[PDB]
């Protein structure tokens, strides 16, 4: 059957370039057009271009003209595609996608490599509290963090019913912020214990924060 | 250059139901319109090419139709499975995307206040947090007001992903100070107007 495994995630300061790398497999490599879309976090599909891998052609959106380059490796049936000079904007998983005959439409498609553009480095979060006051909300603020992901538990999981841990927002500064909230009654505020657990494996990060009324 | 228009948004549905999304193209360039789905955490995945032909090992439930300028996808009998997002193409040109919501009845937002603590004070910065809990549909605004006045662009927002067990929303609106300008003010609170609300609602707190 016919696979297409690109290279593993990428990240890149601004002005860099990344060389992605899409291999495939069961089929005749350089008998069906090789397209590349990317998706900028929590927004729609975008069209880059394509490479015939039969003679190497290639064919640019307008706006990364110049900026990338489309090639491939028939002798390892590997396509690539690099771009140079990355801005914020160029933050996104970027997928190979393969034409079933010769329509223009992407049939097969491979699993996406992300690609972080960021100025930042590691860093592990402050965690605050957000104290409460039939039914009271109260939480735990993870602020300024970076790479993503954090996780957070309470009562080291034993917490789960009306947990809601929003996603993350990237902030001007490069650093990540999120809560995690939850909805307990108020007759327990008084003698329950409720501690968020938070979790950011880059920075061996494991906070356990108490939040009292 | 040629710009595809999905409509509507949004769909909200009940699982069982028909879905029937729409992408409209300004020029018709062509007869030939595929659709793709893609679920959370997932790469797109194409169903429908030129206009009705459904892909290799797609459900049947899925069919698509038109010509020219109009196009349209059906789901017959919506699914749990099928609630995702899905896009038109056509050349090098992509539709907005429509994304397929579960439909419930309108839940009004519980809203929450939560001041800076006292250890990120300590720090030199104050989060306010406006907590809008359980609420449906998605549209909702929220107004931060400092001393009575109304601020812009200083607050950001999150929003879930709808609740597999109650298909409602819960989002976070934080407001986020320095120190100093966090204490030259005494009142701060946060503006909810939501559907399910008769009137606004106002959480606010004295530092």
């Known amino acids: 059957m016919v696979q297409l495994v690109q290279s593993g995630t990428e990240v890149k300061k601004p002005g860099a370039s990344v060389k992605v790398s899409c291999k495939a497999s069961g089929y005749t490599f350089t008998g069906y057009y090789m397209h590349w879309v990317r998706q900028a976090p929590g927004q729609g599909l975008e069209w880059m271009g394509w490479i015939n891998p039969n003679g190497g052609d290639t064919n640019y959106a307008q706006k990364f003209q110049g900026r990338v380059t489309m090639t491939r490796d028939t002798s390892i049936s590997t396509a690539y595609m690099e771009l140079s000079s990355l801005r914020s904007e160029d933050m996104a998983v970027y997928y190979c996608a393969r034409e079933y005959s010769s329509g223009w439409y992407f049939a097969y498609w491979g699993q996406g490599t992300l690609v972080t553009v960021s100025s930042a480095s590691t860093k592990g979060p402050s965690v605050f509290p957000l104290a409460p006051s039939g039914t009271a909300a109260l939480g735990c603020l993870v602020k300024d963090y970076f790479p993503e992901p954090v996780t957070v538990s309470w009562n080291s999981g034993a917490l789960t019913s009306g947990v809601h841990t929003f996603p993350a927002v990237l902030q001007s500064s490069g650093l990540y912020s999120l809560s995690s909230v939850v909805t307990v009654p108020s007759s327990s505020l008084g003698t329950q214990t409720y501690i968020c657990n938070v979790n950011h494996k880059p920075s061996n990060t494991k906070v356990d924060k108490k939040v009292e009324p | 250059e040629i710009v595809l228009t999905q409509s509507p948004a949004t769909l909200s549905l009940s699982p069982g139901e028909r879905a029937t999304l729409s992408c409209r193209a300004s020029?018709?360039?062509?007869?030939?319109l595929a659709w793709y789905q893609q679920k959370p955490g997932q790469a797109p995945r194409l169903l429908i090419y030129?206009?009705?032909n459904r892909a290799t090992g797609i459900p049947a439930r899925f069919s698509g139709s038109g010509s020219g300028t109009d196009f349209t996808l059906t789901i017959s009998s919506l699914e749990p499975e099928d609630f995702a997002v899905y896009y038109c193409?056509?050349?090098?040109?992509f539709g907005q995307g429509t994304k397929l919501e579960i439909k419930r009845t309108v839940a009004a937002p519980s809203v929450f206040i939560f001041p800076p603590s006292d250890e990120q004070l300590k720090s030199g910065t104050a989060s306010v947090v406006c907590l809008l809990n359980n609420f449906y549909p998605r549209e909702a605004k929220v107004q931060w007001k400092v001393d009575n006045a109304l601020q812009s662009g200083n607050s950001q927002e999150s929003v879930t992903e709808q609740d597999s067990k109650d298909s409602t929303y819960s989002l976070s609106s934080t407001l986020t100070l320095s120190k100093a300008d966090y204490e030259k003010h005494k009142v701060y609170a946060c503006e909810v107007t939501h559907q399910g609300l008769s009137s606004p609602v106002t959480k606010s707190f004295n530092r």
């Open positions: 020029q018709s360039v062509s007869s030939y």
């Open positions: 030129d206009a009705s």
């Open positions: 193409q056509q050349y090098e040109f």
